[PDB]
Design an enzyme around this catalytic site. Structure first.
Site, PDB file in Angstrom:
ATOM      1  N   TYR A  13      59.619  95.638  26.524  1.00 41.81           N
ATOM      2  CA  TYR A  13      58.455  96.485  26.743  1.00 41.81           C
ATOM      3  C   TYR A  13      58.312  97.587  25.693  1.00 41.81           C
ATOM      4  CZ  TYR A  13      58.477  93.282  30.431  1.00 41.81           C
ATOM      5  OH  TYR A  13      58.601  92.125  31.133  1.00 41.81           O
TER       6      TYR A  13
ATOM      7  N   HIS B 175      61.398  84.333  36.100  1.00 44.93           N
ATOM      8  CA  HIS B 175      61.403  84.639  37.530  1.00 44.93           C
ATOM      9  C   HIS B 175      60.590  83.607  38.322  1.00 44.93           C
ATOM     10  CE1 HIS B 175      63.248  88.603  36.811  1.00 44.93           C
ATOM     11  NE2 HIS B 175      62.235  88.916  36.016  1.00 44.93           N
TER      12      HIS B 175
ATOM     13  N   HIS C 100      66.930  91.422  33.086  1.00 45.93           N
ATOM     14  CA  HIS C 100      66.753  91.043  34.482  1.00 45.93           C
ATOM     15  C   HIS C 100      67.269  89.624  34.715  1.00 45.93           C
ATOM     16  CE1 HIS C 100      63.301  93.909  33.780  1.00 45.93           C
ATOM     17  NE2 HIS C 100      63.745  94.362  34.916  1.00 45.93           N
TER      18      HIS C 100
ATOM     19  N   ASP D 183      64.457  93.561  26.786  1.00 47.68           N
ATOM     20  CA  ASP D 183      64.317  94.717  27.645  1.00 47.68           C
ATOM     21  C   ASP D 183      65.683  95.364  27.898  1.00 47.68           C
ATOM     22  OD1 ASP D 183      64.587  92.339  29.183  1.00 47.68           O
ATOM     23  OD2 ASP D 183      63.043  92.875  30.620  1.00 47.68           O
TER      24      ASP D 183
ATOM     25  N   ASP E 270      67.685  88.444  28.755  1.00 48.51           N
ATOM     26  CA  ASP E 270      66.767  89.394  29.362  1.00 48.51           C
ATOM     27  C   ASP E 270      67.560  90.353  30.264  1.00 48.51           C
ATOM     28  OD1 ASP E 270      64.809  90.298  31.522  1.00 48.51           O
ATOM     29  OD2 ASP E 270      63.448  89.494  29.902  1.00 48.51           O
TER      30      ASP E 270
HETATM   31  C1  LIG Z   1      58.956 105.760  32.088  1.00 44.86           C
HETATM   32  O1  LIG Z   1      59.845 104.790  32.610  1.00 44.86           O
HETATM   33  C2  LIG Z   1      59.306 103.647  33.133  1.00 44.86           C
HETATM   34  C3  LIG Z   1      59.981 103.009  34.165  1.00 44.86           C
HETATM   35  C4  LIG Z   1      59.456 101.853  34.715  1.00 44.86           C
HETATM   36  C5  LIG Z   1      58.272 101.315  34.219  1.00 44.86           C
HETATM   37  C6  LIG Z   1      57.725 100.112  34.828  1.00 44.86           C
HETATM   38  C7  LIG Z   1      56.529  99.532  34.605  1.00 44.86           C
HETATM   39  S1  LIG Z   1      56.353  98.275  35.783  1.00 44.86           S
HETATM   40  C8  LIG Z   1      57.998  98.457  36.314  1.00 44.86           C
HETATM   41  C9  LIG Z   1      58.738  97.590  37.145  1.00 44.86           C
HETATM   42  O2  LIG Z   1      59.979  97.666  37.138  1.00 44.86           O
HETATM   43  N1  LIG Z   1      58.083  96.689  37.898  1.00 44.86           N
HETATM   44  O3  LIG Z   1      58.818  95.757  38.668  1.00 44.86           O
HETATM   45  C10 LIG Z   1      58.659  94.421  38.156  1.00 44.86           C
HETATM   46  C11 LIG Z   1      59.700  94.101  37.108  1.00 44.86           C
HETATM   47  C12 LIG Z   1      59.613  92.705  36.507  1.00 44.86           C
HETATM   48  C13 LIG Z   1      60.156  92.765  35.082  1.00 44.86           C
HETATM   49  C14 LIG Z   1      59.697  91.633  34.176  1.00 44.86           C
HETATM   50  C15 LIG Z   1      60.870  91.227  33.314  1.00 44.86           C
HETATM   51  O4  LIG Z   1      61.214  91.841  32.302  1.00 44.86           O
HETATM   52  N2  LIG Z   1      61.496  90.159  33.734  1.00 44.86           N
HETATM   53  O5  LIG Z   1      62.759  89.861  33.277  1.00 44.86           O
HETATM   54  N3  LIG Z   1      58.544  99.553  35.770  1.00 44.86           N
HETATM   55  C16 LIG Z   1      57.608 101.955  33.182  1.00 44.86           C
HETATM   56  C17 LIG Z   1      58.121 103.121  32.639  1.00 44.86           C
HETATM   57 ZN   LIG Z   2      63.150  91.389  31.893  1.00 47.61          ZN
HETATM   58 ZN   LIG Z   3      69.188  87.751  32.168  1.00 43.22          ZN
END
Ligand SMILES: COc1ccc(-c2csc(C(=O)NOCCCCCC(=O)NO)n2)cc1
Ligand SMILES: [Zn+2]
Ligand SMILES: [Zn+2]
Ligand SMILES: [Zn+2]
Ligand SMILES: [Zn+2]
Length: 352
Positions: free
Chosen positions: A304, A133, A173, A264, A171
């Site tokens: 995660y 990102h 995202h 993820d 990933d």
């Molecule tokens: C119990 O269910 C749950 C749901 C959500 C979360 C959690 C923790 S933080 C967050 C979230 O979505 N934050 O926004 C930032 C994203 C960036 C991603 C990083 C990446 O993987 N880049 O590809 N969500 C935890 C538990």
């Molecule tokens: Zn991700």
């Molecule tokens: Zn991707």
């Protein structure tokens, strides 16, 4: 050994001073490494040292202004760290963050050099914090510097500028930062599969839709495969690889493959909520091994669920080492997505 592996405990140092339970945990990498030990994979791999990216290497993709800010965090008191973190979308910073981001990128340079100088055939990089990102001018989504982007530029800098590098980003995202960096570049093909939800999913931008195909000479070199609605798993991802990822990658005939390898999209992941199995990520890796004469670097991005990511990433390393791949109609929205990407990319890829 034909597979290299990089892992350094020093990248555990990065941590969230106000939420010691934040999901971007130090033990993401230790749990992956120790699972490599359990599955008897460490003894088969050549251990590649990590090192710091230099500032000149960072400038391959990042502004001097961005570089400057992240480096300044090293001397900040807690209150300033907190303020600085708060300036970006989902970032925490500790005093060790900068050093860890440098390590993550330098670890991947060494891995790329190991592959390109014939030391190993392929490599896996167990690194954090993640990268994809991070934009030219800003940190975002747990990412400080674009590890995979930097590695692609680094690879070019030590071979020829025109080295064809494929980045497959599995990933869950979208790698906004990778897309943006290479959006007008025909020398780096970017392919991303990601949960999209019509923009409702992080990073919450239309940049991730299948109709963003690249700009200028970059037209056709940015492939976005967005998922809308439904817990996608092994069937959708295999189908995406058969109809889209592999036909396009083969035609591009890359000389190095980089995997932005977030886990993820794995079953068990709280953030992604998808259902890709370790065996699934195994088949994906094995398929990509048919490109660039086996010259694939797998770089940790997100993921995660400690058990899911450890079992998944270890299974990828197993495939790189040349182990046999281990042993369902698609959701509708998946057929739909694949068909939309096919239409957006027919202008560029005669395989489609
Ligand atoms: C119990 O269910 C749950 C749901 C959500 C979360 C959690 C923790 S933080 C967050 C979230 O979505 N934050 O926004 C930032 C994203 C960036 C991603 C990083 C990446 O993987 N880049 O590809 N969500 C935890 C538990
Ligand atoms: Zn991700
Ligand atoms: Zn991707
Ligand atoms: Zn990426
Ligand atoms: Zn591109």
């Amino acid at each position: 050994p034909i597979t290299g592996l990089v892992y350094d405990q020093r990248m555990m140092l990065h941590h969230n001073m106000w939420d010691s339970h934040h999901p971007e945990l130090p033990q993401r990498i230790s749990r992956i490494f120790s699972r490599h030990e359990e599955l008897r994979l460490l003894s088969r791999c050549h251990r590649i040292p990590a090192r710091l990216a230099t500032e000149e290497e960072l400038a391959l993709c990042h502004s001097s202004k961005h570089i400057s800010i992240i480096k300044s965090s090293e001397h900040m008191k807690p209150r300033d760290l907190n303020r600085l973190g708060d300036e970006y979308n989902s970032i925490f910073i500790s005093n060790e963050s900068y050093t860890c981001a440098l390590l993550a990128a330098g670890s991947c340079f060494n891995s790329a050099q190991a592959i390109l100088t014939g030391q190993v055939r392929n490599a896996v990089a167990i690194v954090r914090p993640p990268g994809h990102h991070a934009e030219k001018d800003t940190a975002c989504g747990f990412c400080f510097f674009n590890t995979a982007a930097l590695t692609a530029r680094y690879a070019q800098s030590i071979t020829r500028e025109s080295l064809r590098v494929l980045i497959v980003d599995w990933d869950v995202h979208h790698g906004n930062g990778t897309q943006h960096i290479f959006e007008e570049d025909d020398s780096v093909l970017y392919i991303s599969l990601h949960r999209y939800e019509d923009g409702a999913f992080f990073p919450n931008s239309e940049d991730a839709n299948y109709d963003k195909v690249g700009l200028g000479k970059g037209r056709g070199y940015n492939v976005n495969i967005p998922w809308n609605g439904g817990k996608m798993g092994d069937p959708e991802y295999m189908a995406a690889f058969h109809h889209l990822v592999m036909p396009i990658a083969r035609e591009f005939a890359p000389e190095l493959v980089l995997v932005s390898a977030g886990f993820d999209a794995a079953r068990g992941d709280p953030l992604g909520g998808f259902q890709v199995t370790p065996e699934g990520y195994a088949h994906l890796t094995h398929q990509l091994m048919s490109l660039a004469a086996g010259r694939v670097l797998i770089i940790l991005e997100g993921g995660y669920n400690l058990t899911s990511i450890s079992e998944s990433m270890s299974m990828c390393t197993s495939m790189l080492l040349g182990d046999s791949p281990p042993s369902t109609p698609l959701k509708t929205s998946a057929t739909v997505s694949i068909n939309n990407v096919l239409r957006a990319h027919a202008p560029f890829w005669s395989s489609l």
